[model samples]
Target: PKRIAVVAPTYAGGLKKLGANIVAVNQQVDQSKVLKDKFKGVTKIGDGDVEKVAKEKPDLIIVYSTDKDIAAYQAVAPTVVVDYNKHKYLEQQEMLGKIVGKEDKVKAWKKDWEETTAKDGKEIKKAIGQDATVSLFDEFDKKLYTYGDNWGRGGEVLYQAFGLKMQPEQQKLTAKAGWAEVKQEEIEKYAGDYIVSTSEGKPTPGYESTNMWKNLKATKEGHIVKVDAGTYWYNDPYTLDFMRKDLKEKLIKAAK
Candidate 1:
């Protein structure tokens, strides 16, 4: 696969890590500072734009299994449909390794990641306390959203990789869909000891100023960590690595 077309950018980091030449990508990939440079010369095709993708002349194309344009993309190249939610981040990388014939590289990366995360997780847990709970929050369209263990937004790094606990109510509500919309009135039920709040770039206007937000234990104790939503949107190896370090520092600082 000399020229791979990644219609879904979820796995773009892993693909780049596996040394694949990505010739095409969805426009959102350009929004990520962590991924943009890695895919600098790649063509940014709009979602469902098979014509622009075809112009890239990629021999292999990767699209999410749920993409409505999967069939359309297949008309342009040998298409591989991936179930994005079917696997954990590491598992997804292994699956992609087999796709691009880079199993050895994936194996190496996984081993290194496991070792590094194990150390970082231990340190984070030590600083934040063994039983301290955390929760993920993001605001979109004026609605508050909470995430589960597997969804991005650093959920994987905080819960899965670092072995942090999720807020009890959040765990129950987000168990099925990996995310849930929370009414502002019920936000207290989802508050954790430490809150990771993410938005496109900054906090939502006037959200933190609300009495409801200022009353949370996490907020009162200065335990809310802010992250750029664009940068924290994926759980790929590169993104996870960046998140592991970012969260470690912020979690420790907030705990103090």
Candidate 2:
């Protein structure tokens, strides 16, 4: 659809890649340099700002299922509500492509990405050892947490795209909700051969001073790779492409 309004920032990059005209978005999307470039000149609307979105006169409006103002958006235009956790990144792209009538573009892009990841996965596995497990850790509100395959933080690139194993404890803890909060004492149980630690921008302070943090195999072995939490939060094509390369290069270095 021409002039689409997207309340969910996760789909912004995918929609742009599909050649859809994005007329409006949530203001939070501007935080990412990658998304900001794609959404250049687009109107930034506040969360649940139905009137602002209506002013855009978009042909279609896309909102995440968790959005509270879906009905209000529907009143303004044909609206599509999506569940971000319902599909993997590739599947989400295909779904978005279908919604925007750009399935061919999605198909071609998927094929190319899959081939690239396949080769990178093999090379990474060789360097890191095929059985080496990985885990994602993050901090928010001064609490520690871990994520499963679909919760972003490069989880999609590491577990789904690269076919890496998840830490057994983390897999169990994050299985249902895709993430779980853990106490500092339990960090070791979730630690894996390679740990991708993410924070908003800088590293989370104070946690490293604890014995549990220093005692982890990943930490002792220099297998900890840190990433910007803001940049790693989205699994859209643009972010995924950045993550795919970033994670691969970092993993290779950490492996050495």
Candidate 3:
């Protein structure tokens, strides 16, 4: 109803995706292509660059959940936040659907999610084996985080679609990096036949800050794959599709 502007900070995958415009945003976004050529009136603003958004005077601004962006929008206008790590595709679709007043379309999205998950499960089990202890980690802030049940998070990316099985102790390591909270002395505990982690964010300070990362065996063996932080963590449908396809290729390559 109001002039809507989306303020995407640099890290959360910028302005390319900003609306439910059947024509603009929904076309290749959701499954069914049901909303194509149907929906508009939305624009994307980047950096929430204070001076930049002030130029638009949009009544609403949708931003990522990071506190900095929230603070940025406060300085410019009313803002709504989407928790990037909260839910995966289906949840994201539903949230966006309601936000844009297109909640009814979420049904198709939900169906797609279920079907995709089922398909992923098959592919994963076939590739990794049910007994394979797979660990997917991302290196950031100088530490590693195992993708978990969390949304837009890494674990869902690894196992859900690609089908990596968790190590027995992995379920307990939901703390992020290989879970079970392995500290400096305990790092070796998470090591296994296959270990995947990403380090994208620049290093900060302190021993606990990131140096311990250098000492991890996984890093030593180079099992830690450097995945693009923005895409690995938060991204939309079109990208997720590309991601899923790439993942299959990567896993196949790894199998060789």
Candidate of highest lDDT: 2
lDDT of 2 by residue, 1-256 (tens): 4889988888888888778888898787777756777776889998868999999898999898988988888789998999877888899999998988889989999999888998899999999998899988888778888889988789988888888888999999999999899888878888889989885367554565688888898899999898887778788999999999899998899987
Error of 2 at 48 (Å): 1.8
Candidate 1: global Cα-lDDT? 0.84
Worst 10 residues of 2 by lDDT: 199-208
Q: How close is every model to the real structure, measured as TM-score?
A: 0.96, 0.94, 0.63
lDDT string, candidate 3, 1-256, tens digits: 4544455432112223334221112112222121121222423333535555556665666666764767766766677777666666556666666666767666675677558756876775676466655555554455544445443334555565555665555566664532333454454555543555443353432322354556655445444443445455544554456456655555445544
Pairs that collide, model 1: none
| Cα lDDT of model 1 by residue, 10-128, tens digit | 88888888888888877876767677777777788877688899998989999888889887877889999888779988899998899789998889988888888777888888888
Ranking by lDDT: 2, 1, 3
Q: Which regions in candidate 2 have their CA more than 4 angstroms from the true location?
A: none
* lDDT: worst 10-residue window of model 3: 22-31
Query: What's the distance in Å from true for residue 162, model 1?
Result: 0.9
Check candidate 2 and list the clashing pairs: none
How far off is residue 99 in model 2, in Å?
Answer: 1.6
lDDT measured at residue 183 in model 1 versus the true structure, 0 to 100: 80
lDDT of 3 at 175: 46
